[PDB]
Amino acid sequence: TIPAFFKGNAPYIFAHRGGMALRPEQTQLAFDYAKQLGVDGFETDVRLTKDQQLIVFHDATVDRTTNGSGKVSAHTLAELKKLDAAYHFKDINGLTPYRGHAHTAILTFDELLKQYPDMYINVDLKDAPESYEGSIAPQIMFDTIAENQAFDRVLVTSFYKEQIVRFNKIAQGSVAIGASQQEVTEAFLKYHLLGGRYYQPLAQTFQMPTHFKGIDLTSSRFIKWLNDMNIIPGYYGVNSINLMNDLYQKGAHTIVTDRPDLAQQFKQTIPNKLEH
Numbered sequence: 001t002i003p004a005f006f007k008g009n010a011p012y013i014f015a016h017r018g019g020m021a022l023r024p025e026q027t028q029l030a031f032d033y034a035k036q037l038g039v040d041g042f043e044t045d046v047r048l049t050k051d052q053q054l055i056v057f058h059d060a061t062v063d064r065t066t067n068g069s070g071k072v073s074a075h076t077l078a079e080l081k082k083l084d085a086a087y088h089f090k091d092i093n094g095l096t097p098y099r100g101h102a103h104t105a106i107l108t109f110d111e112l113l114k115q116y117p118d119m120y121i122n123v124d125l126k127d128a129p130e131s132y133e134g135s136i137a138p139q140i141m142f143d144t145i146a147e148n149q150a151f152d153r154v155l156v157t158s159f160y161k162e163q164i165v166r167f168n169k170i171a172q173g174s175v176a177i178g179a180s181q182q183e184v185t186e187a188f189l190k191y192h193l194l195g196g197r198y199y200q201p202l203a204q205t206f207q208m209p210t211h212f213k214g215i216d217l218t219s220s221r222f223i224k225w226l227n228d229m230n231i232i233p234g235y236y237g238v239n240s241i242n243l244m245n246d247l248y249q250k251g252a253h254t255i256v257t258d259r260p261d262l263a264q265q266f267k268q269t270i271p272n273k274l275e276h
């Protein structure tokens with residue numbers, strides 16, 4: 001029943017929102033470029049539309065990344081598909097080189113799965129649990145994974161524990177899920193009480209920044225401790241090749257980067273036989 005999300009013996013390199021430092025976030029321009037640069041998959045976010053479709057999108061509103069305004073939840077997919085989601089992407093010249101160009105439209109999560117069937121998906125359920133969108137997004141996420149037979153290549157997580165809990169109740173463990181902040185806290189407590197003999201029953205992925213408020217989270221013993229706890233350590237915001245190799249060597253299993261160019265460099269360094 002447990003999905004074989006992790007295959008081979010190499011950590012997965014994910015492009016942050018498709019590689020948002022180099023191309024307009026969440027667009028085909030970004031996903032195509034990151035895939036060409038050799039990433040193993042895409043980290044991304046989903047928001048629910050007025051007509052209850054999951055789009056690949058970060059903010060609650062379209063203002064920051066498009067020429068439109070207002071909540072995703074107040075727009076139909078049809079209305080959202082008319083927008084230019086590269087409208088505000090600026091290069092270091094200050095130009096907006098992709099505004100008005102092809103392949104700049106908002107993607108649905110369904111067409112992300114169909115269009116990139118070889119990519120692993122690391123997806124964040126963004127709508128809040130107390131919102132209407134949050135109450136139905138986990139089911140629609142599962143329905144989307146199921147109709148595309150993508151159970152073994154999608155990792156579903158959320159900032160909100162209740163969204164993970166809602167999704168996992170529907171998926172019944174058939175899709176890999178992220179470890180919530182509260183779940184890891186409970187794990188540290190059970191560890192201290194029971195001694196080193198404790199370990200989480202089901203392996204879940206705990207994605208961390210490499211640092212928080214001056215605290216370095218990349219210690220070799222911490223990563224080993226989490227692996228000992230049956231917690232899958234992962235990191236985001238990894239934007240140097242030395243840090244990528246360091247986390248690979250220490251036992252991290254997922255790595256989200258804003259610079260998908262590093263993926264190609266990382267993979268030429270590892271043997272081909274470690275990949276599946």
Ligand SMILES: O=P([O-])(O)O
Nearest residue numbers: 017043044045124
């Ligand atoms: O997709 P993120 O930026 O919320 O991690």
Ligand SMILES: O=P([O-])(O)O
Nearest residue numbers: 045058124126159
């Ligand atoms: O605002 P986020 O990207 O930290 O969720």
Ligand SMILES: [Cl-]
Nearest residue numbers: 067068069070
């Ligand atoms: Cl609009």
